[PDB]
Each structure stands twice: as structure tokens, then as C-alpha cells.
Design a protein around this ligand. Structure first.
Ligand SMILES: [Cl-]
Ligand SMILES: [Cl-]
Ligand code: NA
Length: 283
């Protein structure tokens, strides 16, 4: 019920997950920036659900998973340029003129820059704990983006655990999950490019995603910003900041919830997202 492909997007190949390929309206889903992050780790629950009615495209974002960049630069601002062009190159490669879009954290930041730079290519947007607002580094985002200063199974287990408000939702054994996720995290084909993305440090990485008030004011897309009240990585105040500045943005905040809203509250998030794209919360 799901297809994968490797598709040329500019100077490198993008690993792509797709579902609902027979559907007329598409959703592009952009994952977050946990160490070892990829499309499926973020979206494996949302994809089958949304694919009942939507054509879903969920790529590994450049530098992550199986979308290694051919000449990785250093500096977050330069990776944002790459991440934006990657999605445009993907849509062009699939012959898709306009798409709905969902973005988690880093992917939500990329979403904001996509709406700013290429507004004609996008319909509705859902953000989930997005970067893009100004904030001081959190304990979570620091330990995440600077993981490779001191990498270990234990450090990765801690991160994975902190992405959820109730870690037991993950399964009965998080140590085992960290153990199996760790080998992938330590490959040079995963580590080197992650280090390059946030080489300027957490503060420079956060600041790099921030759009100006004028830019945000001029994002005209119908939008839903979702956020976990207890998000340990991106402060809830970011969501409030964004909805204060983006004209057509609604807000939804989930209680007893960690950064990974889509994993902690699978049914609620999946339904809220789908019904938003369906038009249930239109004016
Ligand atoms: Cl992630
Ligand atoms: Cl993240
Ligand atoms: Na454009």
C-alpha cells in the first residue's frame, strides 16, 4: 500500500515514500530533525490514514536518511536553501503544480520558507511544533542538534524518550528501540551531514529559520499550527508567535503531549489534519 522510489532532485537523489497515488489532491509531508530522522519514522502512522483520500508524498529531507546531499555545505541557512529547492525539485519531478503541506519542527520551518519563497506551489499548510519563531535554545533542541558531540545509545534513548510526554506509548522497551535505531545514527552516511546542518550551533540554527514579521504577515495560505503544550524541544510560545503574525493561521494545542504530536496522539492528530485539509474548519 506504499511505494518507494529514488528520484533526482537537482544535484542529488531524493528517497521518496508515496501512498494514495491514484488520488487527485496531494499532501507533502516534511519530517523533523531528531538524529537519524527520516520520512517513515515521522509519518508511518499518518501516511496510511491520509492516503485513503490524499496522494501523500513523504521524502527523506536532504542530508537525512537516504537523501544524502552530493556536496553538503556547512551552516543552517545554506541547508534551508537546499531543503526549499529540494521540495520544489520534487514537485516538478512529479508534475505536481500545487500541494497541501505538513511540516514537523525543522520540516515546519522548511514549510514556512516554502510558503514565503514559492507561495503559488502550495494550498493549505499544517505545522507541528515548527521552528521559524525566535527562541532561546531549549535543553531538548540543544541535546538533539548537538547529539554528535557526545553520541551514545544512552543519549539517543534519552532524546527519543523526551520526544514524548508518555514514553510508554512507544512500546514496552525503549532501550531496545534505541539499540536498533543507534546503528543507523552512527553511519558516516547519516552523521556527517547532520553535523554540517547545525555546525553553527543551536542558537545560529534557530535564528536561521526565523522569518521577518513582513514575511510572515505575507504568508497568505490557510494554515493550521499544531503544538504540544509540554513540547521539550520547541517552546509552545513559538506557536503563539506564529499565529500572531500569519494572517490565516488557526492554532491547536494538545495537552499531555510531547514534541511528536503525531505519535503521541496518532488518532487525534491524524483526524485533525485530515479534517483540516478536507475543509471542515474553513471559514
Ligand atoms: Cl524527527
Ligand atoms: Cl526536531
Ligand atoms: Na516559485
Amino acid at each position: 500500500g506504499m511505494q518507494t522510489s529514488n528520484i533526482q532532485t537537482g544535484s542529488f537523489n531524493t528517497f521518496l515514500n508515496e501512498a494514495g497515488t491514484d488520488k487527485d489532491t496531494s499532501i507533502l509531508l516534511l519530517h523533523g530533525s531528531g538524529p537519524g530522522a527520516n520520512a517513515m519514522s515521522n509519518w508511518q502512522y499518518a501516511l496510511p490514514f491520509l492516503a485513503e483520500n490524499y496522494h501523500c508524498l513523504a521524502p527523506d529531507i536532504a542530508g537525512f536518511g537516504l537523501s544524502q546531499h552530493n556536496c553538503p555545505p556547512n551552516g543552517t541557512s545554506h541547508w534551508i536553501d537546499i531543503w526549499v529547492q529540494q521540495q520544489i525539485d520534487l514537485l516538478d519531478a512529479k508534475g505536481i503544480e500545487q500541494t497541501h503541506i505538513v511540516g514537523n519542527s525543522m520540516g515546519g520551518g522548511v514549510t514556512l520558507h516554502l510558503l514565503n519563497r514559492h507561495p503559488e506551489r502550495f494550498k493549505k499548510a499544517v505545522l507541528m511544533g515548527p521552528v521559524g519563531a525566535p527562541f532561546a535554545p531549549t535543553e531538548g533542541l540543544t541535546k538533539g542538534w548537538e547529539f554528535y558531540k557526545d553520541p551514545s545509545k544512552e543519549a539517543l534513548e534519552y532524546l527519543i524518550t523526551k520526544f514524548l510526554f508518555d514514553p510508554s506509548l512507544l512500546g514496552n522497551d525503549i532501550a531496545s528501540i534505541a539499540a536498533q535505531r543507534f546503528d543507523n545514527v552512527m553511519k558516516d552516511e547519516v552523521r556527517l551531514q547532520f553535523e554540517a546542518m547545525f555546525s553553527g550551533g543551536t542558537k545560529k540554527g534557530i535564528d536561521a529559520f526565523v522569518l521577518s514579521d513582513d514575511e510572515l504577515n505575507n504568508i497568505s495560505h490557510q494554515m493550521l499550527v499544531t503544538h504540544a503544550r509540554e513540547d521539550f524541544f520547541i517552546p509552545l510560545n513559538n506557536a503563539y508567535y506564529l499565529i500572531d503574525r500569519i494572517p490565516n493561521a488557526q492554532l491547536h494545542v494538545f495537552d499531555h503531549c510531547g514534541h511528536w504530536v503525531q505519535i503521541e496522539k496518532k488518532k487525534a492528530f491524524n483526524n485533525l489534519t485530515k479534517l483540516f485539509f478536507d475543509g471542515m474548519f474553513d471559514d
